[PDB]
Design a protein around this ligand. Sequence first.
Ligand SMILES: [Cl-]
Length: 129
Amino acid sequence: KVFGRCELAAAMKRHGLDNYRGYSLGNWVCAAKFESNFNTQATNRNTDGSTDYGILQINSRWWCNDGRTPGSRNLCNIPCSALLSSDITASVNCAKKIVSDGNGMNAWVAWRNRCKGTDVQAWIRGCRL
Ligand SMILES: [Cl-]
């Protein structure tokens, strides 16, 4: 599923991301925008043979099991395919563990390079929430 901007913010808000660990809702929407273009089915291969999955491009190296990333961890205790579903619940819950890591939202390269220190509030302008 390809989310609309406001639809996603509403769903993210319902699942408790708004100001989770100090990151206002605009940050998460901006990250999703640039990570996946709001598409739950996005996949991308990393050079080390690991793969990034879903709306937030969660990586198989550490966070999910895809059965083809030898020596990797499954820290969210999920198959990576659960992260591609139209229901964003698994993605959001796994993002909560990631962002609690120590490194905050710097774990998402697109956030760091494209969202960090910008007017992230713009990403939720005009939405009913
Ligand atoms: Cl894994």
